[PDB]
Structure formats: C-alpha cells, structure tokens
Design a protein around this ligand. Sequence first.
Ligand SMILES: OC[C@H]1O[C@@H](O)[C@H](O)[C@@H](O)[C@@H]1O
Ligand SMILES: OC[C@H]1O[C@@H](O)[C@H](O)[C@@H](O)[C@@H]1O
Ligand SMILES: OC[C@H]1O[C@@H](O)[C@H](O)[C@@H](O)[C@@H]1O
Ligand SMILES: OC[C@H]1O[C@@H](O)[C@H](O)[C@@H](O)[C@@H]1O
Ligand SMILES: [Mn+2]
Ligand SMILES: [Mn+2]
Lengths: 458, 456
Amino acid sequence: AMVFPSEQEQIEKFEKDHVAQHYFEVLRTLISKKSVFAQQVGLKEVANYLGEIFKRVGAEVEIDESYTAPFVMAHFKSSRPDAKTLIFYNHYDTVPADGDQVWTEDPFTLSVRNGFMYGRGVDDDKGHITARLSALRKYMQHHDDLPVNISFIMEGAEESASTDLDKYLEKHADKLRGADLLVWEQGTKNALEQLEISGGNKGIVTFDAKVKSADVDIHSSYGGVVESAPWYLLQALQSLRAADGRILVEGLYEEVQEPNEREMALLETYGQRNPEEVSRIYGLELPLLQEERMAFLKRFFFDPALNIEGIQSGYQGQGVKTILPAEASAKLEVRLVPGLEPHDVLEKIRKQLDKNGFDKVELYYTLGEMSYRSDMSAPAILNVIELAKKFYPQGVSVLPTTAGTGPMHTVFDALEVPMVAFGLGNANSRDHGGDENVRIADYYTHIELVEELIRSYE
Amino acid sequence: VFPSEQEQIEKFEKDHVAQHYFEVLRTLISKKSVFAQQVGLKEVANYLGEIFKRVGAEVEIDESYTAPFVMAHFKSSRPDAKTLIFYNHYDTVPADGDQVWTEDPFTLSVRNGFMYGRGVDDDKGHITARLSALRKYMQHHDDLPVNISFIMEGAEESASTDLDKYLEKHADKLRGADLLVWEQGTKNALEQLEISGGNKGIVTFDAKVKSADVDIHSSYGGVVESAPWYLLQALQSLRAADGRILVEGLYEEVQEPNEREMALLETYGQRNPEEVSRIYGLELPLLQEERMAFLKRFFFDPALNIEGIQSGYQGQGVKTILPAEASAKLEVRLVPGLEPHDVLEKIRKQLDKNGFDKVELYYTLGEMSYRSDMSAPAILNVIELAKKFYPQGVSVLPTTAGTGPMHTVFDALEVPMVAFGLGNANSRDHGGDENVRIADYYTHIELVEELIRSYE
Ligand SMILES: OC[C@H]1O[C@@H](O)[C@H](O)[C@@H](O)[C@@H]1O
Ligand SMILES: OC[C@H]1O[C@@H](O)[C@H](O)[C@@H](O)[C@@H]1O
Ligand SMILES: OC[C@H]1O[C@@H](O)[C@H](O)[C@@H](O)[C@@H]1O
Ligand SMILES: OC[C@H]1O[C@@H](O)[C@H](O)[C@@H](O)[C@@H]1O
Ligand SMILES: [Mn+2]
Ligand SMILES: [Mn+2]
C-alpha cells in the first residue's frame, strides 16, 4: 500500500524548497561554466568553484591538481563514533555542445521549458552534483549532525576515459577505502519510467587488423591461383565466430565469470519484457543472433561479442577494377565481461589466428576498458533498492550491469567499496546529444531518495 | 640464321615504308582516343579511314554507334583467292594518375631502342606495323595473293560496346575468310613469341547488404547481426579454401579441355608456378601449387574474385558501431560453357539456398569466353612461319588469361582466330611508360609480310 506524489506535487515541492532552489541557482552557474577535458577548457575554473561551494557548507575540501583534470574531494564528517562512510562519485566535465546537435537555447544557459531543465551537463553530470548536495543540506535543515560520514569525489576527465583517475584514487585510497557504499555518477529511469539501479559496466578492447598479401595489386585474371588480401582476411574473421555470434577462440570462455543464480533471476525479473523489439526500433532486416528472451538478455548482458566496426579493401566507386587487392584492413572490437582483460583477450585471438593458419593477419591494440559487475546482494545495495521503491510508482529495474563501458573496474580496484548507480535521468535525457535535459520532478525525486538514504543510516 | 637485334633496328631505320608508317604512328599516338571519356573517337576513326583510303583500300567508316567502326578491304586479282582478316582497335585506356610517365603519354618517344606512348603496344602500333607489312609486300610484287581486310573498332577497352551490331551489319563482307589475326600479342619473359587462340571471359557484379535502417551502437553486437558479418559469411559460403567455387550447376557447364589443349599447356605453360610468388612478392601460399594443377586452374577454370569490399568506419581511431551496410565488387572469371547472366543467376540460387537471401546482386559487365585447340591448318601455318623469325621459338596456348571479344567476333564471322603481335613481357599495357621494342615491331612486320607471302 504505497502512495506517491504526482508530478504536479513534486514540481510544487521543488518550487517551495529553499535549499533545492539555492542549489538550482548553483546549477545554473555550473552549467554556464564550460568544462570540457578534450578542449582543455575550464577544468580548474569549475573544480575551484565546486571547492568554494562545498567549503561554504563545512566540508573539508582537497583539490588535487597533480594531473590534467583536478580531482576534488569534499568530506562531511559525522560525530558518531563507528559511523560508516558513504561515497558519492561524480564528474564535473561534460562533452562538447558541438556537431549536428540541435539546441533550442544556448547549451551553456540552463533553460527551463515544459517541466524539463535543459543544458549541457544537466544530466551528465553536473545536475547530479547539485541534487546530491541539496539532499545533504536538506537533511541538515532538520538535524544537528550527520548519521554517517559523507565523501564526494568529483573527477574532471570522465568523458575522456577517466584519464589518471586510477592515479588519483591510488593517491587518496587511504581516506576512501572502507566505505559502506559508493553511489555512481548517474543513473536514469528507463522507457517504462522504472528507476534503473545498476551494479556494473561491460568493457571493451578495440584493435586494428591488417593483411598484406603481395607487394602490389595483381590483375584479377590470377584470382584462381593467387590468394588475395580480402579473401584471407574474410576467412580469418569467419574462423573466429560462429553464425550464432559465439566467439571461436580457445581459452576465452574459460576466463569468463559465469552469472550466479541471483544475477540470472534479476535478468528474468527486470530485463526488458520484449527485447525482440530492437528489430522494430532499428528496422533490422536480418534475424537476431539470440531470439528467445532469456537467451537474448543473457547474451546481451553477460557474454562477450566480436564486432566488425569497419572493413575495407580494393576498389570502391562506380565501374569495375580488375584487381586482386594487396591489402585489406578492419577495425575490430571485443566487448568484454568480468574475467576478460583487454591485452589478454587480444593475445588469445593472436594465438587462435595462428592456429587457424592465419598468421599473416597483423593485429594492433588501440584501446581497452575493464569490466565490472556484482550480483547486487551487498546489504548496502539492498538498502538502496528497498528505499527507491518508496519513490517510484512504476518501481525499479535492478541490473547487475548495464551494457555501457565506464570506470567501475578502476574504482572498485582502488577502493573495494560496493557500488550502485541510480540518478535523475530519463530515457530521453539526450546525454551527449542536443537539448540534454532532466525532468524537474525527477531531479527533485532524486534529492528525496538521497536524503532518505542518509536518514537510513541513523 | 636469325638476324641480331642490331640488324633489325638498322633494317627498320632504312625501310622507307616502315618509316612512313612510323610517322603515321606518331600522329595516331598524339590523338587521345578513349571510349570511356568519348574523346577522339570520330577523330581517330576518320584519320585511319584516310590513311587506308590513300593506299587504295575500299574503306567504310560506319558511325552508327558511339565508336565508329572502320573497315578497309584490299583486293587480290587472283580469282579463287582466300581472305585474311586483321582485327585491331584504335581506342586506348587513359594515361592516368598513379602511373609514371617519363615523357608525355601522348607523344611517341624513342629511348634505348624502345618506343614509348599510350597505345604503342595496345593497340595503335599493331595497326601501323600490319599496314607496313602489306605495303612492304606491295613494293616487291604486282598484286596481293590473298584478299586482306582490316577491321578496326573503337570500344575494345570498354568491352567492345556495339561490336556485335557492327559485325552483324557487315558480316557479308567478312564471313568466309581463311584466318583472322587478333589485335595484339606478346613475347613471354623468355622471349618466345606467344601464339594464342582464346580469351577468357568475365562477369562482374556488385553485392550489397542492408542489415538495419541505421548504424547501431556495438554494445548490441552479441544479439544484432551486422551487414559486414552477413556479407563475409555469404562470400565465404561460395568459395572453398583452395579457390574452388561452391555453386551448384556451375562446373557442369564447363567445357573440359581436350587432349591437344592439355598437351599444349604441358609443353608451353610456365615451367615454374612459384615464379609468380617471386614476381609479385606474394606473402601467402598459391591456391594451386603443382605445375599442371596451377596451369589448368589458371587457363581452364573459373575464379570468384573480390575487387573490393567495404563497410563501416575507416579512418583514424575507433567507432563503436555495427554498420547497417556493406558492399563488395565481385567478378567471376569465365571459361567456355559459362555465360555471364546464367552464372550470376546460379550464384543467386546458391546464396538463397545457403541462407543469404538478403545479399543483393547487380549485374554490371559480362564477356563470353572462347578458345580453340590450335589445330586449324590456317593457324598451324602461322605457328610454322613464326619459328623462322624468333630464335627462342614460340609458345602455343589455346587461350590467354586475359579477357576480350573473341567470342563475339567468332559468333559473327566463324573464321579461325589467332593472336600474335609486337609486345614484350614488360610492355606495360594499361600502365605507365607503355612500350614496344623497335626490333620487335619490325620483326612483326616481317612475320606479317611472310604470312601474306605464304598465300602465293
Ligand atoms: O557468486 C560469485 C560471483 O558471481 C558474479 O557473477 C557476481 O557478479 C558476484 O557478485 C558474485 O560474488
Ligand atoms: O543502515 C543503513 C544500511 O547500512 C548498510 O551498511 C547495511 O548493510 C544495511 O542493512 C543498512 O540498512
Ligand atoms: O574437342 C572438342 C573441343 O574442345 C574444346 O576444348 C576446344 O576448344 C575445341 O577446339 C575442340 O573443338
Ligand atoms: O597458303 C597459306 C596457308 O593457307 C591456309 O589456308 C592453309 O591451310 C595452309 O596450309 C597454308 O599454308
Ligand atoms: Mn556521466
Ligand atoms: Mn588490346
């Protein structure tokens, strides 16, 4: 028997809440200050501003400027002895406004229209920073002390693969290790307005593959006797993957951590009802590689995948060109799951190609990110799940991992604290797109959930 | 017994007829004639028309289709005289981009005992050398002992567009001939004159796959099939590791080589398959390694080739997409018995049967194949005459691996066909600094003159 406020009620609460309003003006200022890692613009400016903001309400603040993007930490202390610690991880850099992106109003001007707030960073990730601070300060309106120690860590290079995050966390692990729970930088409601509460990221390894079959393109009259670069490469790739998408590389699945019973039960309960709908959404013309719902979800969340991002050889254009191309190349990737490390995955692929008779395929490592997940059974995570249900009428969607890539493995490796992601995004927030937005009611609801999480530590 | 190269060059220098047509060649080369660019076609056809008319030939320039068809007939007075036909083309490929040209491609240049220019080998030089041979003969005899017809088309480099129609129209003036001499021929790397009697064929076509409306984030790569995987799977289902084509009903249509054809291969085919590996710097094993297996595959079997394939992202860095589209440019090299349209339809059926109905196929070009076992007496005569002019001997092959209109010409004319000419293994047809050895050019003249004399 749970009752929930209406969207109209949430918006009025938001309008009447002096603390939420104070930090909404702070959000306006933050959005206005462009902070992009890849344009080197405004990182120190935003990191210092955040420093002042948190100092004002009594946090002990440290701004480490050792690497390109300053690393901001703000610790709020509880007077309770044997108090636990809560960590909020967030980032203050955003992607550029840019491209063929359509903006109704200036991307760096926080704009409110039709019950949504618009601006570069309102969802990813600055809005999450002002909402979580709002929550703490609201709790502080009605209490003399915090029931739990609270640490905010804000990096400035999340959109450029969290450059040097590993070096900041190693440097400051002593103050962070041992916390009860770490809440991730963002989260969203899904298409059914269920709050997604997730516990992992998949990883990836990307690499170039190249073949040189001869010193020059040869006349195609020789194609019956002379092997060409594209045939060799097609044969090589075809050797590494079954028609159902299973990867044919020895040693690879042996390293994969299989999902436990809880993880499989979570998928059953919370995974999309009809994942076969991707066919409609993208106008697929070929059948899915895995069609039954659970086979599909399990492949999607818990299996790796060998992907061709591009392949090219010989002649493109109008007309013909009677050649056996000397060179062929491809841009490949393997999506990873826990157990699989980028360099090692590539070495197993080198070995299998050599064993298959394709030693002339050259491989060149380009990028890697490690994967991470949990079965969402840590009691600190269970607490979050039960509290969230009191705030979202459509309920929650609990997932061991999302299919996105991110720094979760880096963070857990340094800090070893249980991690959970939830936030104030909507399925159509357009992160990284034009008119990035957050629903005003969703933003206020995240404040209330975070304040309730703090109260749960009393 | 055989003249030296130095003697040949001197003979060439002192021969007023050869020198006259060598200046004619200079002019032909200077006039760019490329079918694909529709440049110079009427200009070169008209100029040739006049060159032949001047020496008393009965000339017809048919301008019905894009490239004018030129015919020049020289009559013998002998009443039961046979007829000899020369087929040649006056169009060339362009000079081009990546190609290295020491001097202007459209300026005949002589260096180190070679002549250089676009068309000196393929095919303008063959035209002037053959008219030289006829006219040289006429310096020493009262009349031709055989009727001689020159047929010159201007679309050979573009698959002989409308040749078939011109031959249908003029077949009454041409059918009944004793022998037809093909457009060009070369000496092989061992300086043996190649004498051949066939062209392989070709069917080229685009293959395309659309797998979705849009490029999808590659995180879906374990559940959504992409266009490039589907296409690689389709292409691989059609070709065995050893190059054999896996298409039902294809090999059934292949005409097997007879005993003479195989014996010719064995005698005159390359001595060593592995030389190809050395020449091209091959980094992969040959698809057929034993000599006779290699040779039979090269001249007498079809082959499925990828000229190009592309999909998704090329460029700096990565792009986390499953591409929605992939395409390829394919061809099947053909042998007698295989027709372009039928071959492509058999590939359509196999792909559907194999589960690849979504690969789209678009026919783009086709040429039928042709060959003979080189036993026609009119052809044997050429093989014997040639042994008197080339100290390294001759190389007799039923077919070259190149493509050409032999099938179209035979279908209209039904005259025994033989290819021999003035190129060298390094003439670089279709390439930069295309060239003919001066001595080789004059030797061709003398061999063609002797061919005429053999009809007395
Ligand atoms: O049960 C063993 C492990 O299985 C993994 O798949 C889960 O992500 C872990 O949280 C769990 O500890
Ligand atoms: O008290 C708040 C929460 O703190 C976590 O450390 C405990 O594991 C939960 O059981 C508890 O509900
Ligand atoms: O023996 C039958 C036929 O075999 C074919 O392979 C040859 O090209 C023909 O010249 C011959 O007439
Ligand atoms: O007379 C020249 C040649 O004409 C051909 O028609 C005959 O078949 C040959 O035997 C002869 O040598
Ligand atoms: Mn983010
Ligand atoms: Mn030619």
